[PDB]
Amino acid sequence: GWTCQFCERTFSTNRGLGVHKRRAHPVETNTDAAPMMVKRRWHGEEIDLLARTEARLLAERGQCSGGDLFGALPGFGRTLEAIKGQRRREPYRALVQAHLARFGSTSRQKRRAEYARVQELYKKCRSRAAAEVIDGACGGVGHSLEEMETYWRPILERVSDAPGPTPEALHALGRTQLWKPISVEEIKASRFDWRTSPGPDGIRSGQWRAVPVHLKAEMFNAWMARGEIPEILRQCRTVFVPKVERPGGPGEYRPISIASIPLRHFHSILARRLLACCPPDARQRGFICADGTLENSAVLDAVLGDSRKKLRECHVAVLDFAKAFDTVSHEALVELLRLRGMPEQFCGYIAHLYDTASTTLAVNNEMSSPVKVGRGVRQGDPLSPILFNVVMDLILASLPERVGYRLEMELVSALAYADDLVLLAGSKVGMQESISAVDCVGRQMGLRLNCRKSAVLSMIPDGHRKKHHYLTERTFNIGGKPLRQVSCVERWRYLGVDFEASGCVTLEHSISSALNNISRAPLKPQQRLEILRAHLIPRFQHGFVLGNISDDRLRMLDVQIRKAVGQWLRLPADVPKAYYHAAVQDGGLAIPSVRATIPDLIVRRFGGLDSSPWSVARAAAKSDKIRKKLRWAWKQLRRFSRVDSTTQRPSVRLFWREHLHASVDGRELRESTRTPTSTKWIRERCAQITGRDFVQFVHTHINALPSRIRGSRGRRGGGESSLTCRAGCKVRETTAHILQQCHRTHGGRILRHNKIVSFVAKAMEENKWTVELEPRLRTSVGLRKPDIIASRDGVGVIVDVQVVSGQRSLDELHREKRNKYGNHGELVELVAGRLGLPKAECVRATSCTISWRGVWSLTSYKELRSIIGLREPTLQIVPILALRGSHMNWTRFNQMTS
DNA sequence: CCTTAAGAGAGTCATAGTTACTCCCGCCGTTTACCCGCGCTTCACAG
DNA sequence: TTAGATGACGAGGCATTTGGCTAT
RNA sequence: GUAGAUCAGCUGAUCCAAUUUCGCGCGAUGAAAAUAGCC
DNA sequence: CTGTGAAGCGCGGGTAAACGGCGGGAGTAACTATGACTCTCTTAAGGTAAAATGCCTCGTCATCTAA
Ligand SMILES: Cc1cn([C@H]2C[C@H](O)[C@@H](COP(=O)(O)OP(=O)(O)OP(=O)(O)O)O2)c(=O)[nH]c1=O
Ligand SMILES: [Mg+2]
Ligand SMILES: [Zn+2]
Ligand SMILES: [Zn+2]
């Protein structure tokens, strides 16, 4: 009977019809959920403004009544009868005297050229090449010097005519070590980014880095004595960098200005001193030593959660400043720093630095005539964020005192992160005076609010029906210009986190398009693995941790990533799941599993939120959403981790190590953990290996060669022809039989042995040993034949080479090969007599034991690194030789089928 | 020279868990549209 | 007062690494 | 016909292959700074 | 023409008769969480090796004890 007015579905009850109308038809139900406004309760934010206006009029005029207060409050939204009936109350008549007391004081050649570009760029700058592969292109400057200059030159040349701070905002803001000389240990402690381009002056980073520290100290102290630097070091070049991934004009670029490396080093030391000297307002979570993005997103999510759950009025604006650094006036900044109580030498230094600012614009290696700069704060100077924080402190100070949203008895008034601002309010009135305060003190400094991006979210609930409701009509102004309303279904991005009206939602991501782009770039197969490992997956980590995501979507994302890796390395689908995700030291390929990694990072970031210095974040930690999220994160972390033996923390690495070493194909890789030199071929030395050979090593490493036993997984209902050896050995045809046991593969085993013997012998000859290869020694047990014997300084060593299977202990195999020579006794005397030395104690047995998958025996590695002086870059090549010998064995076994 | 190794993950479908609301009924507290005047203003009225 | 033994600190030589990502 | 190989119908497409182009073995392919945070 | 008295108007104390915030109470649409199942399933050769920072090792110097 009950039928929906918007989709005509039929329901059993009015209850289910209402629950349907809430979820399936949001805007229509938000229209029906609108409260009436006949007898609205007086929020205290309205009460404070009415009381303070009445108090200032009792000071200013002496005597007044409600008929004047209706005139003094135009946009207040109360009738004169309401004003009278509020005015007759006793807490208001207390607050009026309380305020009065204070106030009365071709196609083919193009791809060959693209290969030539990509392979050079991958070696010059790997991160740039990876960003080029993922996005599609780079080098985003798409305008001429004229089109850049005719827009940007009247902006830079104009002096900002802002009148500077007013004494009201200075009084609101008001609620010695600096310019001492710089020491040597201060220069040593203050780390610097030496991977940097030089300025127009042309002194490179290594040229300044070679200068000794005490001479740099006396040049810095000399420049502090003058109050200026040499003028050739003070000049700047500007390169325009795009703000949007497809810029539509010169206004969508930013003027990043680069000066000399000594200026940036000196200003970085002064920047760390200035950051230690004057901390900003506690609501400014930007350019300080705290994880402010976590804090701002957590507080905003908690406020938006409690707003819906407890049915309270909640008015939220998101604000931005247009061209924030590029518009600050020299006058307002320098006199604010003077009235902040900074030393006069520092203020004179900043005034003389920005007085003499001249810049050359450079667009695609075409340079402009020099530009005189009238608006301050260079994008690219170390002192510039710390100076912009001083500007933001005035704006944060000028907010009204008790306007905000009270979450867990903390009155959250504002959240700041550089120029980004979120304002919170209880009523329309409190937000409107907050916007007027922010706008006014912004215009005092030369800043203008970004009207393209400023927007307001506004919730007014219904009592007596218990309905949440969001406004749709535009109700707030900057200077008369109406602000935009965020609708109930609108989705917006805050600090790289996706938000809606109910809080955090799932981050919008482009995994499949990026995996398509990597799959088509002209790359070697290991380069695709490195771009996936180091560059693609850490992009979406931030929004997955700070946002909200389910286990299902993470699980499908891991399925997509594993399918991409299985396409690139030509792996079958029954490769163990832990091999993609276990570490390189453990024998895995170290592609991060998003399902396992993201709860671990949510625990490790959000668990520290209780220990924050900021009280608002500690209030947010008590909120219901973050508590529920942290319980889910702890449950999923306990599902996909093992407790580490030493530090007792949960770890994802031991979970993947246990699952890899427990699996059938990964079982032989269990000793790779003890010897990190065995797997340097996977990631460190992969560029020294051809792309065919790398994929053949990957197939050799986790047994993925199509032998008749692994090929017949699930299909072993057939006869012995589906299981036994192709060469007729009448045994079960494993891959290890083909590589290690088959009569067809005997000469390849001999060649692999002789190659490893020759390489070890050449390395021992470089390490000054007197190597004799293959002694035919006739001891009384029979003809015995060690691989190599050698002498150095009277000490003798016998070395023998093994390439073995991993279903036994490798160290046991080393000892079993060792004791054949070391416990022979008489043969040691034959070795000593051949080397010309009498003492049998000075002759030591040693073995060179490595698996056919390229895993070193640990004790044999210690013998070859300690008894013999072989360096470990020699020892990193023996796994490559064993792996390539194994795949040559596999290739010859498949060729000889005839 | 070498001394057999040996299923596993993605997709389907049914049921359970839970989240985010619904509508119904009663009660006190709050709000303000009016009732009821007192002090000043304006035309009748005294001089 | 001088000589020998022990402990601490500094210098020299050799070997290993030389990141990535997000916000503004 | 392709740097080389291969599949199609002299051209396209795909590779485990793939340093083009400009210049005299060898140089250049010309990006990009700052402050925090996280791994 | 000029200042005061009856009627008019604004400016304030008071009431009451609705709103509206909320407790208690019974419900459910429509999303993810678990589990038991089912489905699906590999091959192109050949003989192979510059610079900066941090850690490790060795030497030199200083202090304490004994003669
Ligand atoms: C993104 C970014 C910002 N900044 C600084 C410069 C900006 O003035 C300040 C705030 O950044 P933005 O607000 O992102 O940049 P903007 O204000 O100049 O651009 P818009 O007008 O579109 O808002 O942070 C950098 O120095 N480097 C950067 O990469
Ligand atoms: Mg901005
Ligand atoms: Zn409907
Ligand atoms: Zn065989």
Residue numbers in the entry: 111 to 215, 305 to 374, 385 to 1107
From the publication, what sentences describe this entry?
Pioneering research on the Bombyx mori (silk moth) R2 element (R2Bm), which selectively inserts into the 28S rRNA gene, has contributed significantly to our understanding of this type of MGE. R2, like all non-LTR retrotransposons, encodes an open reading frame (ORF) with DNA-binding, endonuclease, and reverse transcriptase activities. The endonuclease domain (restriction-like endonuclease, RLE) nicks the target DNA, and the reverse transcriptase domain uses the exposed 3’ end from the nick to prime reverse transcription of the R2 RNA, resulting in a new genomic copy of the R2 element. To address these questions, we solved a cryo-EM structure of the Bombyx mori R2 protein (R2Bm) initiating TPRT at the 28S rRNA gene using its own 3′UTR.
